[PDB]
């Protein structure tokens, strides 16, 4: 809450439960790779 | 570029065993005091924590739930971390992840592996 932004964009779709973990960095797989990716140095929030 | 890749699943008998394989892909195990272990979630259960290793220290730690029947070993050439498990049971149907926990002073389980299903039934 205390860092500022030009834009913070929220990013929204649906998957499996058990692929709720690909969206992430650091992160490989069916969504990961051809649906989503997020980037390994991503300073964001994953909320599922 | 650095992922944990992992297969082995399947269908064991009660009683026998199954063994799980996990690659560091993109980096090493051994040379950087990196930490491979084994994650599992059984129908109707989270995520259990089974085993860790640390080739580069020794040492291997597990839960409570699988101590006395699971090994977790590691090839340091292969860069390949296993899990063993041996007699296994019904109950230990679950879907089984390798994870990644680096040395520290703070860490955590970051990198997760794909997940692959063992069937323990008769």
């Known amino acids: 809450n205390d860092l500022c932004f030009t834009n913070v964009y929220a990013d929204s779709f649906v998957i499996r439960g058990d692929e709720v973990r690909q969206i992430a960095p650091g992160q490989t797989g069916k969504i990961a790779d051809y649906n989503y990716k997020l980037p390994d140095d991503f300073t964001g929030c994953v909320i599922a | 570029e650095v992922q944990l890749v992992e297969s082995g699943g399947g269908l064991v008998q009660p009683g026998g065993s199954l063994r799980l394989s996990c690659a560091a892909s993109?980096?090493?195990?051994?040379?950087?005091?990196?930490?491979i272990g084994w994650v599992r979630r059984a129908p109707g259960k989270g995520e259990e924590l089974v085993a860790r290793?640390?080739?580069?220290?020794?040492?291997?730690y597990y839960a409570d739930s699988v101590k006395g029947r699971f090994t977790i070993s590691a090839d340091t050439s292969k860069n390949t971390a296993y899990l063993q498990m041996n007699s296994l049971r019904a109950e230990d149907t679950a879907v089984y992840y390798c994870?990644?926990?680096?040395?520290?002073?703070?860490?955590?389980?970051?990198?997760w592996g794909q997940g692959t299903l063992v069937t323990v039934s008769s």
């Open positions: 994870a990644r926990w680096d040395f520290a002073g703070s860490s955590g389980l970051d990198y």
């Open positions: 290793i640390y080739p580069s220290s020794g040492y291997t």
């Open positions: 993109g980096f090493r195990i051994y040379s950087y005091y990196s930490y």
